[PDB]
Swiss-Prot record, chain A:
There is a cross-link at residues 40, 75 (Glycyl lysine isopeptide (Lys-Gly) (interchain with G-Cter in ubiquitin)). Keywords: Acetylation, Cytoplasm, Isopeptide bond, Phosphoprotein, Ribonucleoprotein, Ribosomal protein, RNA-binding, Ubl conjugation. This is Large ribosomal subunit protein uL11. It comes from the Eukaryota. It comes from Oryctolagus cuniculus (Rabbit). One of its GO terms (cellular component) is cytosolic large ribosomal subunit. Ubiquitinated at Lys-40 and Lys-75 by RNF14 and RNF25 in response to ribosome collisions (ribosome stalling). PROSITE patterns: RIBOSOMAL_L11 (PS00359). Belongs to the universal ribosomal protein uL11 family. It is found in: Cytoplasm. Its main location: cytoplasm.
Swiss-Prot record, chain C:
Transmembrane segments: none annotated. One of its GO terms (cellular component) is cytosolic large ribosomal subunit. The gene is RPL9. It comes from Oryctolagus cuniculus. GO terms for biological process: cytoplasmic translation. This is Large ribosomal subunit protein uL6. Component of the large ribosomal subunit. Belongs to the universal ribosomal protein uL6 family.
From Swiss-Prot, chain D:
The keyword Ribonucleoprotein applies. One of its GO terms (cellular component) is cytosolic large ribosomal subunit. The gene is RPL10. Component of the large ribosomal subunit. Mature ribosomes consist of a small (40S) and a large (60S) subunit. The 40S subunit contains about 33 different proteins and 1 molecule of RNA (18S). The 60S subunit contains about 49 different proteins and 3 molecules of RNA (28S, 5.8S and 5S). This is Large ribosomal subunit protein uL16.
UniProtKB/Swiss-Prot annotation, chain E:
The modification Phosphotyrosine is found at residue 20. Coiled coil: none annotated. Belongs to the universal ribosomal protein uL10 family. GO terms for biological process: cytoplasmic translation; ribosomal large subunit assembly. The keyword Ribosomal protein applies. The lineage of its organism: Eukaryota, Metazoa, Chordata, Craniata, Vertebrata. Ribosomal protein P0 is the functional equivalent of E.coli protein L10. This is Large ribosomal subunit protein uL10.
Length: 153, 52, 190, 205, 196
RNA sequence: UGCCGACGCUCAUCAGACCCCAGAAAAGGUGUUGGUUGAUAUAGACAGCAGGAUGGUGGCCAUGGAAGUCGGAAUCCGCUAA
């Protein structure tokens, strides 16, 4: 009896207050028993919230990972994570090139909810500076490069 | 204790009203001006407070 | 400024026979006869059209207040046509929390007695307007039905019986009890 | 604490300033006269709105401060703290007098100083707000809110000048580009054709 | 701005009416762009979809009545909520796959059910709840072991039956959506040909 | 003026009615009348009856936490009929 659940996760680090209990409620799995695996199977993120989906069978779980749109940008931009205090000035002050955005373009090409290659670079390069980051500059530098000098295959 | 489709009838006729801030007149919900002469037909209106 | 002419128009169906004595409109059809007098409006009413299919209301040299009364007459005559052809039915529910509103009908629908409203020992006797018949209906739990030809008399009797069951010196937002008008319509459908 | 403003409303006496004869005057209630982004250049706040008196009366310094505080606090909420410049163009110089009744009556009844009011004529600008052209209705609403702190009647007028200057806004950019006007911080300097030519060479070089 | 987009709609009509002269008109009835984008992903290499003002649509094509006399009958056949989808390739495969790509939409209060809808025997997944909203219409259901477990199939709404909000919360809680509202085809255009 | 006076304005359940002068203000009114200015309207407008308001995003900010809504710098993209 397959029954998937949509659950948002925190990362490889263990949180304090649990909110994953009622969705795993009706089939009856232990919360920390599945919470150790939901962090250890994920592993790589460790610092930021990510939707790690939970596809549970009739007996045991499957830990599948569905990355978000800009969470992969935060993952690619390698800020060293501090402790769980969420201290001041943990802003994203780093440099991103034009090759760390085409992987999201090919991913969302493979998942097929987008325009063509200009469109699927146009969402993520537009939303790269939405957080407060810069791809060596602000959003005015992605309207010049797409016109007659793009990276369209 | 009560039925909801019968409840909204009584809330329509009793509490879904506008109150004039100047003379406390009970007005229809789509009111922009009070109908009373003694407040000068003012536009200073508020909704009637919902009971908790 | 005074507009030279303002006219509006009522299209009368073939089931209705209409006649006029100056500004006194008489309407006769399947359910009865209605008479309304309009000597306080000071307009010109014309029953043109052969077999009298169409009625025309004129205001000559009128200001903004006087031009508002034209479609008022055109709505009143349409209400009389609607009430002589299809009639008027005011279906109304009684809402209570604890004490059931006991409604009984006397003198063939011309008087309505209300008992046990908010647990009171007082009996509310509501006279009805002449031409309006009130009855406890079926297929619904606590609902009264008012019948008539005149929308004025039917809705005024509905207002009388609604204001009869009112809550004194309490929060009426909490004590949502009474007899309230639910639906306004006709006797038979169209 | 003090008398109502209906007593000292009309310009009845001769002007009675703070001087070497009238000493002992208490301090005026308004001391800050212009505020906001007053350290702003000319070409970025082109729209100017005036509150203009329609009466010949006296406006108290307490009313001036109460009006400019309200105008500031609306314009900060509306357009941000650094998107305007409010300048009160009325300074309280007339000194009104108080004759205390502690019983000598009217014997030697010349008043000690009580407060300061500003003598205002018909057509005289009370406050001026300069900002960008997009904040026109906010200036109108801010001056309309500040009208309620004043006695009498005031009007609201959007000026045809460029900001806090005396030159028309339709010709201001052309007159700047022809180098007949030079930006000088808040306002501009007009350059005539009457000086020595060594300043013209420094201008055009 | 509307003044420039109003001129941009005419070029979009003008340079595409000469492209695809095979126009199967669909009806956008209470549909969202979240459902439109799901259509637009499969419909890229074959057909293009468009929405706009129907009067401005009546204005754009009546400037083509002189130099394209094959577009005469489109003005009596654009009434109501009408959008375009433009196709060149085939007339049968766009019948096949447009009726294939469907996502479920939630129930409403005043939306007809065009066929017979059954409620199969399936557990609700929730324990003790409002049991007075199950026998009101006539559904037989015994509260067995706390959790509400329904028994049999009850025809809640047949064809020619007006619906209300009395059967909406029980569908919303159990995620039972009866009908998927889709782009139904109203008119057929193949170079002048009209079909039902 | 018992002129077949002229043109308008005004309804007051506190109308108004003639220098000094014998009683009123700020602020208001979708009462009504006249103006000034700015929009959009057959490439079909204001009403009036539905869908949809989300992807980034649960934005970063400051917090015990504020997730399009309790503060403040900001205020950019896609798909687009939106
Ligand atoms: Mg009490
Ligand atoms: Mg004097
Ligand atoms: Zn009032």
């Amino acid at each position: 009896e397959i029954k998937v659940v949509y659950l948002r996760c925190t990362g490889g680090e263990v949180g304090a207050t649990s909110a994953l209990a009622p969705k795993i409620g009706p089939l009856g799995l232990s919360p920390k028993k599945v919470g150790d695996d939901i962090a250890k199977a994920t592993g790589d993120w460790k610092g930021l919230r990510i939707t790690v989906k939970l596809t549970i069978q009739n007996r045991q779980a499957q830990i599948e990972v569905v990355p978000s749109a800009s969470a992969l940008i935060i993952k690619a931009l390698k800020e060293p994570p501090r402790d769980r205090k969420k201290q001041k000035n943990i802003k994203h002050s780093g440099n991103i090139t034009f090759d760390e955005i085409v992987n999201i373009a090919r991913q969302m090409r493979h998942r097929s909810l987008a325009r063509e290659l200009s469109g699927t670079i146009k969402e993520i390069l537009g939303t790269a500076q939405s957080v407060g980051c810069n791809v060596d500059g602000r959003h005015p530098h992605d309207i010049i490069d797409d016109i007659n000098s793009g990276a369209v295959e | 204790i009560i039925e909801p489709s019968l409840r909204q009838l009584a809330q329509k006729y009793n509490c879904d009203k506008m109150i004039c801030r100047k003379c406390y007149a009970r007005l229809h919900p789509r009111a922009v001006n009070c109908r009373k002469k003694k407040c000068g037909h003012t536009n200073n209106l508020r909704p009637k407070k919902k009971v908790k | 400024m005074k507009t030279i002419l303002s006219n509006q128009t009522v299209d009368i169906p073939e089931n209705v026979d209409i006649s006029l004595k100056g500004r006194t409109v008489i309407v006769k059809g399947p359910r009865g006869t209605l008479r309304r007098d309009f000597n306080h409006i000071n307009v010109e009413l014309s029953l043109l059209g052969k077999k009298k299919k169409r009625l025309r209301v004129d205001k000559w040299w009128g200001n903004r207040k006087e031009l508002a009364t034209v479609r008022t007459i055109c709505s009143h005559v349409q209400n009389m046509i609607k009430g002589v052809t299809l009639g008027f039915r005011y279906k109304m529910r009684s809402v209570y929390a604890h004490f059931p509103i006991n409604v009984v009908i006397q003198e063939n629908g011309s008087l309505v007695e209300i008992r046990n409203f908010l647990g009171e020992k007082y009996i509310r006797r509501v006279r009805m307007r002449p031409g309006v018949a009130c009855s406890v209906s079926q297929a619904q739990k606590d609902e009264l039905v008012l019948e008539g030809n005149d929308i004025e008399l039917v809705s005024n009797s509905a207002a009388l019986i609604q204001q009869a069951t009112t809550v004194k010196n309490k929060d009426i937002r909490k004590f949502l009890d009474g007899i309230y008008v639910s639906e306004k319509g006709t006797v038979q459908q169209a | 604490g003090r008398r109502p403003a209906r007593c000292y409303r009309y310009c009845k006496n001769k002007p009675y300033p703070k001087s070497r004869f009238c000493r002992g005057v208490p301090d005026a209630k308004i001391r800050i006269f212009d505020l906001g982004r007053k350290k702003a250049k000319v070409d970025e706040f082109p729209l100017c709105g005036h509150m203009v008196s329609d009466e010949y009366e006296q406006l108290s310094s307490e009313a001036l401060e109460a009006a400019r505080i309200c105008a500031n606090k609306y314009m900060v909420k509306s357009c941000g703290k650094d998107g305007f410049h409010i300048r009160v163009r009325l300074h309280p110089f007339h000194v009104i007098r108080i004759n205390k009744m502690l019983q000598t009556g009217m014997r030697g009844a010349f008043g000690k100083p009580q407060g300061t009011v500003a003598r205002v004529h018909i057509g005289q600008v009370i406050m001026s707000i300069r900002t960008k052209l997009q904040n026109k209705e906010h200036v109108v609403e801010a001056l309309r809110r500040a009208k309620f702190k004043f006695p009498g009647r005031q009007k609201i007028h959007i000026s045809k000048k460029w900001g806090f200057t005396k030159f028309n806004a339709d010709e201001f950019e052309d007159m700047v580009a022809e180098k007949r006007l030079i930006p000088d911080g808040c306002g501009v300097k007009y350059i005539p054709n009457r000086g020595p030519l060594d300043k013209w060479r420094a201008l055009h070089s | 701005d509307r003044a420039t987009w109003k001129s941009n709609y005419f070029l979009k009509i003008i340079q595409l009416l000469d492209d695809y002269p095979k126009c199967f008109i669909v009806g956008a009835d209470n549909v969202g762009s979240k459902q439109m984008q799901q259509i637009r992903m499969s419909l890229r290499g074959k057909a293009v979809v468009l929405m706009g003002k129907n009067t401005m649509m009546r204005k754009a094509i009546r400037g083509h009545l002189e130099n394209n006399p094959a577009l005469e009958k489109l003005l009596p056949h654009i009434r109501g909520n009408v959008g375009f989808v433009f196709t060149k390739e085939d007339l049968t495969e766009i019948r096949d796959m447009l009726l294939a790509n469907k996502v479920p939409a939630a129930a409403r209060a005043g939306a007809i059910a065009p066929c017979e809808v059954t409620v199969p025997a399936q557990n609700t997944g929730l324990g003790p709840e409002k049991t007075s909203f199950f026998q009101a219409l006539g559904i037989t259901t015994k509260i067995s072991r706390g959790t509400i477990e329904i028994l049999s199939d009850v025809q809640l709404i047949k064809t020619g039956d007006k619906v209300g909000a009395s059967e909406a919360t029980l569908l919303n809680m159990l995620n039972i959506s009866p009908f998927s509202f889709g782009l139904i085809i109203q008119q057929v255009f193949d170079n002048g040909s009209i079909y039902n």
